[PDB]
């Protein structure tokens, strides 16, 4: 488990260890009908066609275009009424929503900092641990080398 990141100051060693890990891997080796049509639409990459009729039409048609004509009138009157209540308020309704979006945005970036601080704070605690033990390991190795030659010089 133990491998000191802060204390151990190559890419060759990653490439080396990857090969040894690789060799040990060589050894081991809820919705209704809605979901059916939605998954089929996405898989096939084709959206279902809508009513491309109101836009084109034609004068001196028949009973069919008499309907299609009368459709264009009522929707154009609804359109012109739908543009009236927008222009009445105008830009006040738009800029009121623009202000809401600024309150929504700043909240996210506050959380970006809260995460930033606690993430650096955890790493900060790790750092001290790394330097604590890395010294202790240094102490151990020095003592190790002392015996190694001490035992020889006695013999």
């Amino acid at each position: 488990m133990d491998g000191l990141s802060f204390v151990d100051k190559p890419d060759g060693y990653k490439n080396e260890i990857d090969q040894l890990v690789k060799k040990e891997f060589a050894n081991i080796k809820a919705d209704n009908s809605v979901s059916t049509l939605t998954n089929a639409l996405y898989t096939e990459y084709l959206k279902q066609r809508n009513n491309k009729k109101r836009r084109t039409p034609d004068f001196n048609d028949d009973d069919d275009t008499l309907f299609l004509e009368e459709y264009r009138r009522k929707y154009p009157r609804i359109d012109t009424s739908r543009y009236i209540p927008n222009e009445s308020s105008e830009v006040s309704l738009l800029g009121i929503v623009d202000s809401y979006l600024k309150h929504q945005e700043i909240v996210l970036d506050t959380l970006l900092p809260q995460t930033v601080s606690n993430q650096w704070r955890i790493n900060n605690d790790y750092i001290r641990q790394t330097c604590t033990i890395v010294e202790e390991m240094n102490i151990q190795q020095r003592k190790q080398i002392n015996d190694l030659e001490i035992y020889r010089k006695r013999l």
Binding site: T38, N39, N86, L93, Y151
Partner: protein
């Protein structure tokens, strides 16, 4: 400011008293009837337990609402969840490659733990 189920910006937000989290009324009311518990914390919660607590500028070119806008909404719902199902499938596959490579490393360490200390032991014995 958002709902904690769909990812909406709620029109009638309602907060639960067991876990302080704001949901849109329709979506929290649906969960309680499906299974009577809080979705996040899995704690007992009912419809009576809930406590009830926005402007969108309709575009200038607002026919399109029936045809173009509604079409885009069910395209965007369709191709996202399909792509999201694709993302979930790969995470489980990449999970299996993670755990296998992990256990492969465990065996290396275990194999090397026997190797190193016995090599060190042999140096201690050599002196004699």
């Amino acid at each position: 400011m958002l709902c904690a189920i769909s990812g909406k910006v709620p029109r009638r937000p309602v907060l639960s008293p067991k876990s302080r989290t704001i949901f849109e009324k329709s979506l929290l009311e649906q969960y309680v009837k499906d299974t009577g518990n809080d979705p996040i914390t899995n704690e007992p919660l009912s419809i009576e337990e809930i406590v009830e607590i926005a402007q969108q500028a309709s575009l200038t070119e607002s026919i399109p609402n029936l045809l173009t806008s509604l079409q885009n909404e069910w395209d965007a719902i369709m191709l996202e969840n399909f792509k999201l199902r694709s993302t979930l499938d790969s995470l489980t596959k990449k999970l299996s490659t993670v755990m296998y490579e992990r256990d492969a490393a465990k065996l290396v360490a275990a194999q090397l733990l026997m190797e190193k200390n016995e090599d060190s032991k042999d140096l201690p014995k050599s002196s004699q």
